[PDB]
A paper describes a structure:
PII-family proteins are key players in the regulation of nitrogen metabolism in bacteria, archaea and in the plastids of plant/algae. The monomeric unit, of circa 11–18 kDa, consists of two α-helices, four β-strands (organized in a double ferredoxin-like fold β1α1β2β3α2β4) and three protruding loops called B, C and T. In the trimeric state, clefts are formed at the dimeric interface through the interaction of the B-loop and the base of the T-loop of one subunit with the C-loop of the adjacent one. These clefts constitute the binding site for ADP/ATP, magnesium (Mg) and 2OG.
MtGlnK1 without ligands and MtGlnK2 with Mg-ATP/2OG formed macroscale-size crystals in seconds (see Section 4.5). The N-terminal His-tag is only partially observable in the MtGlnK2-Mg-ATP/2OG structure and appears to be highly flexible, without interfering with the ligand binding site. The adenine part of ATP is flanked by the phenyl group of Phe92 and the whole molecule is coordinated by hydrogen bonds from Thr29′, Ile38, Gln39, Gly87, Lys90, Val64′, Arg101′ and Arg103′ (residues are based on MtGlnK2). For the 2OG, the keto group is coordinated by the backbone of Gln39, Gly41, while the Arg9 and Lys58 coordinate the carboxy group via salt bridges. Mg plays an important role as a bridging agent, binding the three phosphate groups of the ATP, the keto acid group of the 2OG and the side chain of Gln39 that closes the hexa-coordination. Structure comparison of the ternary complexes from MtGlnK2-Mg-ATP/2OG and MjGlnK1woT-Mg-ATP/2OG and structural homologues shows an excellent fit of the T-loop at its base and some deviation at the top of the loop which could be due to the crystal contacts. The tag in the N-terminal position seems less consequential, as we did not see any differences in ligand coordination between MtGlnK2-Mg-ATP/2OG and MjGlnK1woT-Mg-ATP/2OG structures. Contrarily, the fixed T-loop positions in the Mg-ATP/2OG bound state prevent insertion into the Amt channel, as demonstrated in previous studies.
Residue numbers in the entry:
A (entry chain A): -15 to -10, -2 to 112
B (entry chain C), C (entry chain B): -2 to 112
Amino acid sequence: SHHHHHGSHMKKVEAIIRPERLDIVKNSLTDAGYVGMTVSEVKGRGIQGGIVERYRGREYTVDLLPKIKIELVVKEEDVEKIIDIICENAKTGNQGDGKVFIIPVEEVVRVRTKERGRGAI
Amino acid sequence: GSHMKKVEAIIRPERLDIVKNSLTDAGYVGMTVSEVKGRGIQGGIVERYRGREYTVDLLPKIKIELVVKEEDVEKIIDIICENAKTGNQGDGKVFIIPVEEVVRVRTKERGRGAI
Amino acid sequence: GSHMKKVEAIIRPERLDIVKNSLTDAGYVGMTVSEVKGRGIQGGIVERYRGREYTVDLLPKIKIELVVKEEDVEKIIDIICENAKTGNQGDGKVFIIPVEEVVRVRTKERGRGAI
Ligand SMILES: Nc1ncnc2c1ncn2[C@@H]1O[C@H](COP(=O)(O)OP(=O)(O)OP(=O)(O)O)[C@@H](O)[C@H]1O
Ligand SMILES: Nc1ncnc2c1ncn2[C@@H]1O[C@H](COP(=O)(O)OP(=O)(O)OP(=O)(O)O)[C@@H](O)[C@H]1O
Ligand SMILES: Nc1ncnc2c1ncn2[C@@H]1O[C@H](COP(=O)(O)OP(=O)(O)OP(=O)(O)O)[C@@H](O)[C@H]1O
Ligand SMILES: O=C(O)CCC(=O)C(=O)O
Ligand SMILES: O=C(O)CCC(=O)C(=O)O
Ligand SMILES: O=C(O)CCC(=O)C(=O)O
Ligand SMILES: [Cl-]
Ligand SMILES: [Mg+2]
Ligand SMILES: [Mg+2]
Ligand SMILES: [Mg+2]
């Protein structure tokens, strides 16, 4: 017995990774056919708030570290494969390896031709 | 809906002033500019040296971001495309991303009046 | 909804350390910082040389991005505004952008627990 009770299909993959994993990540994405990408130099910290460096028996926090931002605007159906590639290639087994954010994209336009939408990705 | 959007455009470094000035002339002034590298669908360019070839797969580009009233987006797309284009692969790409809220730091004004 | 958002704020370079420390003290630590240039609605500043005026239409700024749990957005807006403001045009702007998914690279943990 039971008691009665009361799209664009486009996305932006924004990932922060270590500088020394950029070429590995880029090459795996390229090999898989996910080519269009924008890369930025950034600084960051994750939930641990940076690292501690020692000098003359004293600890000093370094609360921003060099990182690389990659952005790929993609067809929605490609997001999970790209997440997988980024994670597999960026990981090293150490805190600081990176984070991926998925952000909606409502429109894409290629400048040269004014093509719009998924065909412009 | 918020009726605000973010226009994120990647253009050639030599078209930054042209595009910025054209936007300004049309009254679309608030903007954030970043130096980036990138490649589009062709995966870069091929450079020749000493009988060899090398693919340069990230090239200098400029990112402009304008957070704008939604009803201005198409006009801004048109200005960016007209002024960034050169007829050559690599001219750029424009992305439109939703923005839910905007706050001006100095006065704490929020929404479309803070654009 | 995902109940996750991106706080993207542009602030003065000389207010970064103050803002970052206040965010840290409130427990909002994960953050990405970029060097950018920008102008707001006034279109830059005027610099004088030999009694002539010249427009400087992009100035150095700092971008901070925090991807956060939605329930923290208003407090973070408050912190950024209170710490970044100086009473002068140019103090900054905050944008809130939806985030549909977050993944921690090292472990592949996803969602709000990965923030
Ligand atoms: N919530 C967040 N918002 C914005 N940027 C972030 C966030 N979390 C991480 N980042 C960026 O990603 C980079 C790498 O983060 P990191 O790998 O340290 O994340 P984490 O959550 O601390 O995981 P881990 O325990 O593996 O270190 C940071 O230096 C920062 O640039
Ligand atoms: N899908 C994408 N995601 C992220 N960034 C992109 C994407 N496509 C292009 N970009 C960025 O825009 C810049 C210019 O792209 P580009 O003009 O080469 O695009 P394209 O699709 O290859 O078109 P074209 O055939 O005109 O060259 C790239 O170098 C990169 O920074
Ligand atoms: N609509 C916008 N889109 C993108 N970036 C913006 C926008 N408005 C401001 N910015 C960025 O924020 C920075 C600071 O803007 P600013 O504080 O001058 O805003 P404002 O609207 O002109 O307010 P104020 O009257 O207090 O000066 C700019 O230099 C630019 O990097
Ligand atoms: O970024 C690193 O390499 C270590 C620091 C870290 O994991 C963090 O600040 O969250
Ligand atoms: O960016 C360029 O100038 C040429 C290369 C290009 O169009 C691309 O990589 O897609
Ligand atoms: O950014 C500054 O410090 C002053 C200029 C300004 O407020 C603007 O261009 O909107
Ligand atoms: Cl974004
Ligand atoms: Mg960490
Ligand atoms: Mg191209
Ligand atoms: Mg201003």
